[model samples]
Target chain A: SFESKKPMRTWSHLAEMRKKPSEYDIVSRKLHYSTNNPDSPWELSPDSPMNLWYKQYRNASPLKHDNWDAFTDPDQLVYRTYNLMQDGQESYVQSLFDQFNEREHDQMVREGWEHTMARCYSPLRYLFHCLQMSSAYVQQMAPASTISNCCILQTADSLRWLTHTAYRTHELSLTYPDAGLGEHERELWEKEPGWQGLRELMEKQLTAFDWGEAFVSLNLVVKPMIVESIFKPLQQQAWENNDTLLPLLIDSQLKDAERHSRWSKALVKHALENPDNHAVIEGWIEKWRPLADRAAEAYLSMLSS
Target chain B: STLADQALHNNNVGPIIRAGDLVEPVIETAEIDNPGKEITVEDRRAYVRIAAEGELILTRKTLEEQLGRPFNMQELEINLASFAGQIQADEDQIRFYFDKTM
Candidate 1:
């Protein structure tokens, strides 16, 4: 009975909510849709707000302090990834909890656990972790020319979540493509299952990826390992067909974890084989293996505790 | 180097305002070539540059956006005071430079 109890998988509730009857429980879709005030203070054009600030500062500042280097490249990625991941984790976890009764669809939820976490955190983290591992190895060996390409890749990958999700959901319209999905997709996605699922996975990946990548840059290996370790149980729990909220929880977490896993593994293989420099090839295993192990441990702690 | 050097010099001014690259007002002046002809003149005109020394005339609205909250005149003045210098230089007086006769 536990094995057979599978809750409905389609986003019927969300779809129905968008239609006439369920409209009342939500804000008048008009609030989100119809209102347009071009001159309003909050009506910010999507073009880089920071540039506006810079122009204004140049116009007004008396001192004219030209000491450049205000913001770093990776910092922006970290900031964006942090925001994206937090949104994804919060929405994904809450959506799952909200949709499935922890009591009824437990088996399906648990079955889907690995993927849920996989969808959210695993792919990005795995790539990031490998980047650090390769970088650390390079630091031990090559520590020269391109030990830092990993950082650049990590930064670019911050923006990659949008791309990853775009491909996954078959979304082609790119507004920032770097910063986020276009408004059209946002509108289409809120009610669509594939997009809803994509939103969750991309976000989770962004968060864990940000944390792990940041730590790697800081010469710290603790966090990346922590995220990787958590996914294991989440993976195992996801494997189980528990007759409770477990499978549904897993599903909510991993919708596309398996897919990302494959992508990340290929990336890892390429990095390893390319060894793009001596630092990558002749790198010390001691520097990276421990980080990977600890990350694994951290992931487990996240699950059990 | 010239602009930056000038900026560095402006840093030393008592008011701490960058003179802003010595912009020459883009006005070209030359002698009129009317040897012995009747000249035409009408209403008087003046272009003046004036400077006043007092508390800066800070806009409360601009401050409000920065603080992400509404700010009154007093609050804005207080915030302005925190900067190293808050001197506002304004050219209020018209300069009587050009003169012509009929």
Candidate 2:
């Protein structure tokens, strides 16, 4: 007689866990219910709008793998842990804002930087919103729920960055009314030469549309080379211009950036498990390389004094 | 050099946590949870790399007890700069295992 030894567990894939599966495994694993389903993914007809959209954008994309679900974020984040961790981080960010306010950060900054804030810093919410959208695109279209979850947290971080920028702009507007810290951001975001490189790049990155291309272009190309390139200048100029709080605000976002970098790096590493993925990822990274470099230069040249 | 280098050559199972306040708690937690096996640590100042023979395990319960507050798996990953072995993580426990033959 043949005997079987697959452990009984909540999730069939997670039977390797000798004990009962944890809450993380149970909720987070195999959550893409429509994935690779023989029937219509959403129980819609085969040629339904949503089903056709997935077939065109996801299944027929240049990116492919034998098992996309093999991807797992190192963090293995679940809702409980996400709330626990981000609350800890948000508390720290609040402390930064609180301490800086008490110290009168606006009063200490030099006169010229307020105009820079009007043009360069305050309008960052628009750029950050683009990032949020890109992250949401990946969140919706990623092959595995695990990959999507990372993008979800990424989406939240983009919101946090936007809120931080908006709050600082609001506070600055109270002090630097003539500079139009909050009021003039739209003009600057739309018309200014400094913002246009990023604007064009971001607007195009939004339209990138392919989930894999969106992630690759945004995380690997656009973010690191384009947006992240802004941070060093923003911080250094803050130092020189006697604007302390701006740098602190930027540093707070670094915590999120480090996490974002890890997940993207890890996912791309996992994606390479299918050797064919190497060329595809490389191709995507290369396709937007020049645009990203130009985009960074446009912002950095103006931001760096 | 041979004995020290020998262990380095065959090193497999571990979590490389960034060096900070979290290190001692993680070290103690692994010691308690791993049981009967020796836990070795290499402190490179930038980060602490800890290892065991073929398997290493840690539990949030033990870690939180050491930490004197709530600790979650995501927070562990936050400080985790890198790791050596394959990871199998759940909410309550995280295990690092390496089987070279298979």
Best by TM-score: 2
Q: After superposing candidate 2, which stretches have Cα over 4 Å from the reference?
A: A1-7, A17-20, B1-102
lDDT of 1 by residue, A221-270 (tens): 33233234443454455455342443444443343333233333333343
**Model 2 chain B: worst 10 consecutive residues (lDDT sum):** B65-74
Q: TM-score of chain A for candidate 1?
A: 0.27
For every candidate, what share of the true interface contacts is present? 0.00, 0.00
Residues forming the 10-long window of minimal summed lDDT in candidate 1 chain A: A63-72
lDDT score of residue A213 within candidate 1: 31
**What are the candidates' individual DockQ scores?**
0.01, 0.04
Tens-place lDDT digits, model 2, residues A1-305: 99886656356688776544555556777788778673466688898998887777777778887787867777777777888888887888888888888888887888688888788898899999989989999899888888898999899989999998898888888777888877887888899888898899988888887878988998988778734688867888889889877787788788788788888999888888878889999999999988888878888876764
Question: On a 0 to 1 DockQ scale, where is model 2?
Answer: 0.04
Candidate 1 residue runs with Cα over 4 Å from true position: A1-99, A102-228, A235-243, A255-261, A268-286, A298-305, B1-102
How good is model 1 by TM-score? 0.23
lDDT of 1 by residue, B1-102 (tens): 989876544211111112221111101000011223222222112221111222122233432333322235453222221222233422321111112211
